[PDB]
Each structure stands twice: as structure tokens, then as C-alpha cells.
Write a protein that binds this ligand. Sequence first.
Ligand code: NAD
Ligand code: NAD
Ligand code: NAD
Ligand code: NA
Ligand code: NA
Ligand code: NA
Lengths: 516, 516, 516
Amino acid sequence: MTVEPFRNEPIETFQTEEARRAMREALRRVREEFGRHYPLYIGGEWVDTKERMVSLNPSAPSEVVGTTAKAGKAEAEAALEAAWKAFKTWKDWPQEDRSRLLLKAAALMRRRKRELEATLVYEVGKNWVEASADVAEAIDFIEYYARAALRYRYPAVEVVPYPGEDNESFYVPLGAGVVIAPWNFPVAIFTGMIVGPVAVGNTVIAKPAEDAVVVGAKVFEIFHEAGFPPGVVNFLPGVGEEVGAYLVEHPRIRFINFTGSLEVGLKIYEAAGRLAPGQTWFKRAYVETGGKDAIIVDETADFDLAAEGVVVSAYGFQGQKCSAASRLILTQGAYEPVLERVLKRAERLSVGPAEENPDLGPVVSAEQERKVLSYIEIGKNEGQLVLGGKRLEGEGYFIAPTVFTEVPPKARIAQEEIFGPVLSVIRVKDFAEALEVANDTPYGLTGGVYSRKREHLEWARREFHVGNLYFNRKITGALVGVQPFGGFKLSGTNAKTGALDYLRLFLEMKAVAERF
Amino acid sequence: MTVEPFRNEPIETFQTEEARRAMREALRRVREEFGRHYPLYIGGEWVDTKERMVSLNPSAPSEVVGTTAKAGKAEAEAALEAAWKAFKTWKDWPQEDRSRLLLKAAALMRRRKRELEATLVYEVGKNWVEASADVAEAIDFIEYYARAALRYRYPAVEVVPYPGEDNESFYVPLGAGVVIAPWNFPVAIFTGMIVGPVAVGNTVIAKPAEDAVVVGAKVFEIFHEAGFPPGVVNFLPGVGEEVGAYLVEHPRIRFINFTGSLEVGLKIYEAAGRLAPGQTWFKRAYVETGGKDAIIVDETADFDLAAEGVVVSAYGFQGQKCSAASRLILTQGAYEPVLERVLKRAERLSVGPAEENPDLGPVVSAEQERKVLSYIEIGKNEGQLVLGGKRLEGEGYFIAPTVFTEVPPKARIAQEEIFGPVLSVIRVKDFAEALEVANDTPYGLTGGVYSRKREHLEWARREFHVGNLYFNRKITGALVGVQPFGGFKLSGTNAKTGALDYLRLFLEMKAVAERF
Amino acid sequence: MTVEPFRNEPIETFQTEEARRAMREALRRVREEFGRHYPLYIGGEWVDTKERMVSLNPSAPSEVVGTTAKAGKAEAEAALEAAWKAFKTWKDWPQEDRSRLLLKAAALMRRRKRELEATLVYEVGKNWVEASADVAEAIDFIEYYARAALRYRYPAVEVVPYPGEDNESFYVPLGAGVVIAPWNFPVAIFTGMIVGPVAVGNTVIAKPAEDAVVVGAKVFEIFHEAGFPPGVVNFLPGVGEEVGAYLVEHPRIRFINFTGSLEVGLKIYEAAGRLAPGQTWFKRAYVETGGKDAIIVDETADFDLAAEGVVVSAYGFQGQKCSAASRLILTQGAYEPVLERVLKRAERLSVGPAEENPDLGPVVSAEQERKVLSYIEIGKNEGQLVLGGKRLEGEGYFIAPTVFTEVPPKARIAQEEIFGPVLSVIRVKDFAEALEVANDTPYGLTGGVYSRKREHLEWARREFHVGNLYFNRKITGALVGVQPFGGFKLSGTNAKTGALDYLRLFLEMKAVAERF
Ligand SMILES: NC(=O)c1ccc[n+]([C@@H]2O[C@H](COP(=O)([O-])OP(=O)(O)OC[C@H]3O[C@@H](n4cnc5c(N)ncnc54)[C@H](O)[C@@H]3O)[C@@H](O)[C@H]2O)c1
Ligand SMILES: NC(=O)c1ccc[n+]([C@@H]2O[C@H](COP(=O)([O-])OP(=O)(O)OC[C@H]3O[C@@H](n4cnc5c(N)ncnc54)[C@H](O)[C@@H]3O)[C@@H](O)[C@H]2O)c1
Ligand SMILES: NC(=O)c1ccc[n+]([C@@H]2O[C@H](COP(=O)([O-])OP(=O)(O)OC[C@H]3O[C@@H](n4cnc5c(N)ncnc54)[C@H](O)[C@@H]3O)[C@@H](O)[C@H]2O)c1
Ligand code: NA
Ligand code: NA
Ligand code: NA
């Protein structure tokens, strides 16, 4: 297989009339399609159920974007049988053939990108550029993993020779596993977590987040059109604590690929460590969990550059990112100039229905709204509220960009992942204290430093203990291939997505010697 | 760092007068030192305790080979503080400096090889060649990991560039972890499990098996002379279910590197999945557990070659190997010719005090003797005893090479790891059935096939589901670098020792972007 | 597949008592088996015929060394059906599996080397070292081509990428072909010409020389034990102009691999250019034919070194080599010193029964004896006989080392391949004239220069137009891998044996594009 060198899919900014025209038409068609029903996908066919999952428009939750079928234990069992049956032959496909299947799926996704973006806008309340970034990242995962998988092809292992013998070590896929995905990047992360394992010969049962079942179905439309053999990928929208837990705990699930909250990841990792009755392997579980990500700014920084990057990092997709800047750590000399600039920029942010392409759409659900507002109440008794802190008028789940300042490093709002548009500002003496405060959380996902001082940047390179660190730029939007993505500590197991290493997680090695 | 390409340390065969003289001299020096007491080693110093561990000569268990200190919770805490303190600076050593330290340790070990072999002979009842193989493998782990670690050096990760930015991804070590080691390869595996993590910047608390505390201490003498900084490696002989479990469950233990029984491995993996109170990471646990390994012989094989390889594989070190052939699966045409030859060879094997270089020494302990004899009793109810099956005369734990025939594939003796000199012979119809029987255990560590038929060998390459497979040769004695070692299924987590991939298990990745 | 880097099989010199003992034992075993009959080998089985081929001991031609079956048209058809049937599946074996099969065959051959050497001694009258070189070269071809074939494995071709497409180019084998082999290296060349095409997925019908049918059969015993699938290699001893020509001209023969006389090579190449009735391809024919090889010596040479190298090159295996020095071209200053030394050395050469390890055995047959004696008669009319030129006493075909001087460059004995122990000495003015005389034959296989003058050596490198050129050493005994072997002009098609390029001759390329 010879293809062009990997390049990232450009993210559409909708500055041209052509782009606007295409997006308007895509939004119109998706809107006109509200109420559509999407079945499960098991063993190469769409399979309906009596019960259903309902997906609302968070900008106008009286509106049903669509419904899907709902997978319970029986459907989980059918999916397991289909996946294991498929594994038997899928594992034996030449890698070139599997990689070509991924490239076909990428081409099909690229041709439907405006539709998928529009679906994100309505289903999870992304503005237009956030939706475009999500779909572009999904395409990137497919393109990248298709190529990366070839690096593991038979027989890939470097071994020491021995006289009179052939010694051959090679990788093989694990089997059938479950992918359990979040609602905040329900095209990108859903796609990446499925196609990585599948590329190298595993089969997958995919459980999309409840709030993002429709766009998950559309991804499966693409898989089906691409022509993955029956059973290779299966789509099981359903309740996480029910069908998700059922699969995690199952003796016949070989691996678990999970991205989501720490609370859930902890349960999954613990369950994975247990030998279910009749289980005949040690389960592999990859859990990529939340963060409490900080940007440090010192007195040497470009304060205007810093303020812009902080606002993008804190409020992009309403702060609903594992990578979002939820802490702003300012040295004494940076405090007033940066805070004033951040407040001025943040107070100008628009909030409204995602279809209008505002700066911020709504948060994803009534439950998310309730949690963010609850943390705002907690914050009022911990730090000083200096911007926002209110639900805005409207049926949609609109929350104003919020800033607390003089926040104690150990305050709940400085330690716990809020996952909404709520920034906590922490005042410290100097760069050394900034790093101490940055590191003193249970998490270790993303971080940033704005500084012109070389020694501070290189110090942070060595000691700001996060998996994805950025200097003099935003801390969100890690690009596949460019920035291997994944954290330390309670931000998860450090499975680095969009990196060569990711696929190794879904392989085991055999060593075969023949003495002639 | 530029050193010669890796080569395996030659295994001494003692065919020369000089080698035999050197061994006798070593045996004498070692037995003259039977009175010795070896403290713990914590934070760069030998530290004694009130209580002690006693080590016996399994060939003459009324003879004490040495005593050691005994680590409890306080000593585990002292070792943790030392290991975390050391980690802070050890992680920052240039890789070249750490690799040189390993190379020094290897040179020191090589200079002490006869002493270590003699210690194995007396402490765990290895004959001369088994002892030499064990020490040589230890040297190999050090030489191999020293070189392999340089492949991960700053900044090792291949990433896609982005305009106007430096993107730099690199590996960092995890922290302080615990190594919990078996008695059966108490120089080789003890050494490998310690020096792999340490090479790339981790620090280690090492817990040797109770039955092999003296030789473990001698390995630490080598580490100390080599000059590992205080706290980098720590020696904590003690009781597995006490100090071992304490460290496994500890919130401040970052990883666990375990080799031992499935029973214990299951507990360790389960415990590792739990978040201990105050723990701030997802623990990594590598558990490399037992096997129920088969050799298949078909009617096209060289039956004499097969019989020799089977006897070596089944009875080397009294069958006390995770890799030992405990099942012999014979197609109908191979059955009588191979069984007759195996019996003729096995009946000629000598059993006695290990220092006399018999074919078999004793099993390692009264507990092991009890276990093996109990399985012989079970086997008498399940199959037909045709050779051995008896304790032999003397205080030493001498057990005769044992063969059961007419063993049902689902019999306890055909499924459960006996870990003694007991071979179960299973008759099957053809090669397909041989593979079915081979695969139908909870394990997947080693296997072999004797056959001249190319299609049978290549079929086994694809479908005999074991981590280490060998054709027309013994299934034991995997060489570092040549045969990455580790299994599938309940044989553990497939951490492939003596392979480039091993060191990756003890690293995490950071990605750092600077926008200029 | 990972094996040790290629090394040449050492050529036994028999300087030790053990080697001499082993040879005597082999000679005894072989002569005890002189009564044996060897069938054809077709479709994985030995198949006999009514008629037979008889093989004689050229050192005692009243002594039969063995008999074989005799292939005619019906047997050629049976072999074709078997080879095409096998090709259908053999082409689809992974390259690693085919290469392992070769490696097995090499191991089996190495274990039988003394037996094969002894068979060469008795069947074709090689002395001990000539026999050992021949078998060692055979082993080398198998070891080298096994490794070289992996360099062509799917998908091996370097292509330029194109947007939105996968472009994949890869090699496939041609089909079933015929190998037609000479008697002078009937283990080495017979083996190389078969296993090269077979390695990369072709199937072969092998036609050994009439004078070397027994040793060819022994090579097939090795192939059979190695377990090549039925039809992959087939053994058809028979008459060249009958069954050989039949296969060459056949519409269903895909390629011809020939080594032999120019006379026969010309007929084969011509026939291969024709479209037989119903043929559906352009046949590939590789024809590696004779030489009229010269050594040039100038007045700057080490004359003793030159004389030794000339005598080795001219008289090794009785001059019955395509590489043998049959011309000695001496500049005026070199003439007397070199000729005197060549004569002194040549007159001391022993001639007798090959089993006694004389310097020269007999020529291979009554026909060869007739040819060589006839050329001696021609030479007496063209040049001056100064040594030998006589049949020696005994039934065996013993001919004395022969030297003609004052030979005109255009003389028949200076132009035509004699293929016996006959050296023609030509006096020239200077090095320029030496090169002119060297180049002025229809051939271009091997050549040599003895000279200390750098400018003369480098001039010859550029202008002595032979495929295999050697400076200050013998011109025979090209080693696999070290010296790609094959000539220019009427020495054949320049198929370079023991070189990476050789296998390409037996492959065609497919290019497959998928637009996504
Ligand atoms: N580290 C990363 O790369 C990354 C990326 C995106 C989001 N996240 C994290 O995800 C969280 C937001 O996503 P979310 O609200 O969907 O998370 P969530 O944990 O509530 O749910 C994630 C998925 O797990 C399922 N689930 C819920 N309970 C389960 C159970 N007990 N067993 C099995 N599955 C169960 C859900 O149905 C959903 O499919 C945030 O904490 C965010 O930081 C992390
Ligand atoms: N897969 C491999 O590479 C491999 C290699 C060698 C041995 N083994 C296996 O090891 C076993 C024999 O070794 P063993 O008898 O020393 O095994 P074991 O499981 O009894 O003990 C191994 C180590 O764990 C410690 N231990 C015991 N209980 C513990 C607990 N609950 N928590 C923490 N540590 C505990 C012991 O003290 C010892 O140091 C066999 O099953 C054999 O197959 C496997
Ligand atoms: N270039 C080289 O690598 C090389 C190597 C060895 C020998 N040779 C040459 O081989 C010759 C000696 O070998 P030989 O006497 O066996 O050669 P040859 O040409 O007489 O016979 C070679 C093979 O071709 C067969 N044959 C004869 N006539 C045929 C026909 N018309 N159609 C098809 N096959 C036919 C023979 O039976 C034999 O198997 C010398 O000329 C020597 O230089 C060349
Ligand atoms: Na929704
Ligand atoms: Na002991
Ligand atoms: Na002959």
C-alpha cells in the first residue's frame, strides 16, 4: 500500500461564501431530518428494538434531533457472538487490505463532513468551527491509524538471530472488545477508539454516549457503506451503567477502550482487574479520563496573546473538553494585566443556539446544566465571582462565561472537574509557585505556559507534569499525529491517541522458533 | 554510548577440566559461607532486622544455606521513601549514564558467575547446566536492556510536524514500583524484572521469593558494588502475602512487576485495578504467570529427536519451569514410537543431590514436594501411571521422573500446573485434534511441535495459541533477545521479556508544543 | 523470518584426521550403494519407468555407480500437470514459509555433505576438494536465495504516491518452468537453478545432465525429506535432445533456466523466442553458456603467485569449468619467467582415480575424452605442444595436463571451448595488446590479471570485458553472494547467480490502484 504522506484534514473556518453556503445547506437538511430513527448495527445489519434512546437539541430541548434503538443484555450477547465470529477471519486479513478499508471509510466521511458537522451542531451544541474540528479529527484518526497499522505488519519484531534457527516474532490482535465513548467529541473520539483497534485486526462493540447517539449512528452508516465485514464493528447505543457495565464485566470481553469521566473510569479499571467467572485472560482496559488543566502566565508573557489563548482554551465548546483551561495561574506581575484582558475578552463572548454559530452554544443536557450551576454556587463560597455565574434566558441550556478570582489552590472549584464555562483564577508569587500549584491536583492532562523566558519554558518542559503541554498557544485541539494525546495521574492510562504507540495497545506478540 | 552488538552469554557445559575445577572451587567457597546472614538493602545501605528468613538446601534440608533479614511494613515504608527520593534525581540521569551503570553490573555479575551458579545449586537445587543457564540469562537481561533503553532516549517519538511550532514527544519513567519474583529463576528473572524498569529511570523495591533469598542478596551485592545511587534498587526479602501484598496494595506504589503463580497473579492484578485511599494514578501491573505447556508430535517427525526434546523440556530443573512440557500430545501414528522412546530416555535419568550434577535435583521445598505428590495421587485416579510417581530415598526432596498415559484432555493433571517432574501423555486422532487439545487449557505460554510436514508447522505457527512456540526443538530456555518471552491467556499480561517492547511498559509519554 | 546474516559454507580441505576418516566412510557408504536404482520424482512421489539411464564411474567406466528412470514425453506431461497444479497454491504461500522450506533443505544438505561429495567423486570424477566446493556452493545457493527472496516480498515496489488513491505494486512468480543442468557442477548449479525460481513461488521440472543423474537424484531425496509440496519440484533424468527439447519447445512451459554448452544454449534461446501452437506468453529463457577464459600476466607481477593461480585455474577439475583458464596471455617481459614456472608446476600434477584425491581425476566420459583428444590433435597443427597431450594408462579417462605455446590468437584452440586440461599460451607485446587478445573471442565469462601495476589493474577493471574478473588470484570458484556469477557475449544472458538480481528474473510485476 502506497499513499500520500499523512496530512491533517484542514479545519473549516467558514470565512468564504462557498463554505457558508455549504454549511447552511447541511444545517437545513439535518434540521429537516429531525425525528429520524436509527437502529442498532449488529453483524452487518441494522437491528431495531422496542425500547428507544431519545436525543434532544440542547439549544432547544423540546426538539428531538432523533431516536435510536436501545441495546440491553440480549443485544450485547448478539453483538458478542457477531464480533467473535468476525474476529476469526478479520484477524487473518492482510494488513494492507484492512488499511485500505479504513482509507475508504475516511474518503466516505470526508464526503459527508458538512452533514456530520451540522449533526454535531444540533445534537451536542457545538458552534460551526468546533463541529468542523471534531469531524476533521475523526478523519485524521482514520487516515493516521490506517498508515500506522502498516508499521506493525507481519513479522514486525526486531530479534537477535541464533545459529541453525529461524526466530520470528510478530504481532496479533487480541479479539473482540468494547469501546465506550463520551458525548463531547462524539465523532472524533468515537471514531478513533473504534478504528484503531479494528485496523490491526480486532473487532469492536461500540457504545456511544447517550447524548450523542444520532451522530454515532451516522458514523456507522459510513462504516456500513465502506463495507466492514459483518461483526467487525457493532453499534450499541444504550445506558452506560446498564449495557456498558454489562460488557465491561463480561468474561468474553477481551479489552475495554474507554474515554469519559474519572468516576466511571475508576469503576471500569477496577472491574477490568477482576476475573469474571469463566474468563480466560487478563483484560486490558484503557481509560482516558478528565483533567483540571491550567495555563500559567508570568510577567514576561505577551499578555494580549495570553488572554486570547486563555479565552479560547477556557470557553471553546463551553469548557466541555478534557483539555479545557479551567485554571488560570498568574504570577504577581502578570495578575492585573492578564486578568483585566481576560475579563474584557470574555465579557464580549456571544451565547446562543449553536446553529447561529455563537461563541458559546448551550451545555449538553439538563443534568450537565445542573452540575455546572451547582459548582458555580460552591465557587461563590470559595472564590470571588467577577464575571457571569448565571444561567441565561431561554429553553436551551445556556450558561454565561464565568470567572472566579483569588481562588485558593485547594478549593473545590480549583480541584474538581466542572466541565462547563467556569474559569478559576489563582494568584501566585512567582514561576516556582505557579508550577507547584499547577502540579497539585489529582490530574495531569493538558497545561500551558505563556512566557518569553526560555528558562521558564524549559523548566516547565521538565516539570509541569501533564501529558500534553503547550507554550505560547492554546491548550486545546491536539492534532492527530502532531501531538500524541493523553495524560498522567488520574487523567488516565496514558494511551496516546494519534500516535504510533496507540495501536500496540491492541496487539499481543508471538515468538516462533524453528530449529532446522 | 557505543558497545559491541548484543550477544548471548554462553552457557557453560563443563566439558573441560578447567570448568569443572572452577565449579568445584565455587561450590566449596559457597558452602564455606553457609553461615552467612544477609541484611535488607535500603537507600544504599545494608539494614538488618530483628526477625529473619532461613534458607535451606533442598538436597539436604537439615542444612541451612544462609539467613536474611525480614522486611515488614516499617521496612517497606523505609524502602518507599528511599525509592521515591532517589527517583527525583535518577529519572534525570542521561540514558547513557544509566545504561553504563547496567553494563558495569553485568561485568561484575560475569566475574562472579561460578559463585552465583554454585549458590543456585545449593539454594534451589539446580544442576550445573541449569544453574549456568540461569546466571547467563541474568547477564543477558542486563546487557540487552542497557542497549534497548537507548532506543527510547530523549526525544524518541516520531511525530508529524506543524507550521510555526516545535512539537516534541518523549518518554519519561513512571516512578517507584515493586518487583515480586519467583524462586525458580531467582537470578535471571529477579535481575531482569529489576534492571528493565531501572534502566529507563524507574526505581525499584525488590521482593525475592522466600526460597531464594540468599542468591537474591548476592545479586544485590553486585548492584551495590556497581554503585547504583541510594534508593534506586532496594532488597526486601520477606513473606509474599505480608510485605508483598502490602506494597501491591499501597497507594504510593506506581507499578508492579510480578512473575509467579496464577493464583497470586490474579490477586495482584485485581488489587492493582483498585484506587487505594489517596492514590493519584492508575497502577500498572505486569503479571507473568504459569503454563500447561504441550509438545505435539505427529507421525512425520524424527521420533528420536522428539523424544530427546520432550525429556529435556519435561524434566529440566525437575519440571519447575513455567515453560516446561507438562503435556505430550501424540497423533495416533506417533503414539507408540514416541512414547516408547520417551520412556526409555526418562527411565535412564539420574536423580540426586544437585551438586553432583544429576539429570534431576530435588524439588525446591517440602511444600513443593507435598504439592507434586498430591498431583501424582490425583493422576493415579485420572490416567495410567507408567513411570516414576514416587518420592526417592533421602532427606532431600527427590521425586522420580513421572509419566501418566491415557490422560483425558480435561483431567486435572492435563489442565492444572503441577510444577514438578510429571508428564501427561494424551493420544489424539490427527494434527487438527492435536491443536484443539493443545489450545484447550486456560493457559498459553509455551508449546512445541515435532513434525517434518511444512503445512503442519505453518498451521501451528498460525493457530497453536502460545506466546513462545518452538518447532523441532525443546520448548524451554528462551534466550534473551532471540525469543521475546511471555504468554497469552492466563499465562499473564504478555510482557515480553528480553525484547525492545519490554521497556515501553515502564515509560509514559509527554508531548510538548511551542508556538514561536 | 530472522536468521543469522549469510555466510559461505566453508570448503573442507581434509587437513584433519577426522575429515579424512569421514570422507573414507562416505566413500565406502556410497560405493556399497552402487547397485541402487533411482526413479523419477513427480508430484511428490518416486515414479519408475520401463527404460533406464546408466551412470558410470569415469575413473573406472566398467563400474556402474547407479541407474535412474528415464523420462520421455509422457513423463514430461505428467510433470507439467503436477507443476502447474502445484503452482496454483505454492504461489500463495507467504514468502517466509517458502524461505523456511529452503532453509530446511539447506540444513538437510549440510548434514549429508560427505555423502554428496563422495557421490561427486565417483560419478563425475571430482577430487576431494573440488567435490567439497561443489556441495558447499549448493548449500550457499539455498541459504542465499532463501534470504534474498524476502527482499521481494509483498508489496516490494517503490512507487510515487497519488492523491486520493492507494497505488500498490508487487511481484508475482511466473509459473512452471524447466531447469536443464550440466554435469560439471551437478550439485551446485543443479540446486541453484531449481531453488532460486522455487523460492519466489515458481514450480520446476528439473532435467539433470545424463552424466550426473545419480547425484541429481540424491539432491531430490533432500527436497523430498524437506517436504516441498507435491509438484513444486520434479526430477526428470533423461536425454537432453529428447525430453529436454520437448519441454523447451512446449507451449505450457513458462520459463527455461539453462546452463550448458553454447551449441545447446543457442538452440534453446532460439526455440524460446517462438510462439508454440496455443502458447499464451512470451517465454523467458536464461542461458548461461561457456567461456574461453584468459589470465593476463605482465612483467610487474609476482610470477610465482601467477604460476600457482594459473595452474589452479587451468587444471582444477581437469579444466572442465566454464570459468577455467584456457588461455594464458603473457607480455614479453613476463613470458619466459611465467611459462617456466607454469611448466614446472604443471609437470608435478598427479592424475588418477578421483577417490585417491589426485590433482586431476579423469575427464567425465568417453565422449569428453574423444573431444579433448581431438582438440589436442588440432592444437598440434596450430601451436607447439610443450607438456602432456596424451591419454594416460587405465580404463579411466585420464588425460595429462597439457600446454601449447606459440598459439596464434585466432587459432581454433585459442577460440573454441575445449573443456579439458589444455592451456594455450599466447605471447603479446604489452598490456594493451594483452587486453585486445583477451577480448577477441566470442565469449566473456571469466578473466584474470596478475600485475602489481595499479593502472593496468584499473584499466582491466574498465576494459577486460568479462562478467567475472579477478586480480592476483585464481579465476575459478566464484563464491555465492561475494561474486555474482555470469558472463557477457556468447557466455550467455548475464543471469547473475548468487546475487539479489537473480530472483527478479523469475518474477513479474503487477500494479494495482484503488481510487477511494
Ligand atoms: N482523556 C480524554 O481524552 C477525554 C476526552 C473526552 C472526554 N473526557 C472526559 O469525559 C467526561 C465527559 O464525558 P461523559 O460525560 O460522556 O463521561 P461519562 O463517564 O459520564 O460517560 C462516558 C461513557 O461511559 C458510559 N458509562 C457511564 N457509566 C458507565 C458505567 N458504569 N460502565 C460503563 N460505561 C458507563 C456512558 O454511557 C458514556 O458512553 C469528562 O470527564 C471529560 O474530561 C476525557
Ligand atoms: N510466566 C513466567 O515468565 C514465569 C516464570 C517463572 C515462574 N513462573 C511461575 O511462577 C510459579 C512458581 O513460582 P513461585 O512458587 O515463587 O510463585 P508464587 O506465586 O507462590 O510466588 C511468587 C512471588 O510472589 C510472592 N507472593 C506470594 N503471595 C503473594 C501475595 N498474595 N501478594 C504479593 N506477593 C505474593 C512470593 O513471596 C514470591 O516472591 C509457577 O506458577 C510458574 O509457572 C512464571
Ligand atoms: N555459464 C555457466 O555458469 C556454466 C557453468 C557450468 C557449465 N557451463 C557449460 O556447460 C558445458 C558443459 O556442460 P554439458 O556438457 O552438460 O553441456 P550440454 O550443453 O551438452 O548439456 C547441458 C544440459 O542440456 C541438456 N541438453 C543437451 N541437448 C539439449 C537440447 N538440444 N535441448 C535441451 N536440452 C539439451 C543435456 O542433457 C544437459 O542436461 C560447457 O560448455 C560449460 O562451459 C557453463
Ligand atoms: Na443530544
Ligand atoms: Na532454599
Ligand atoms: Na558418470
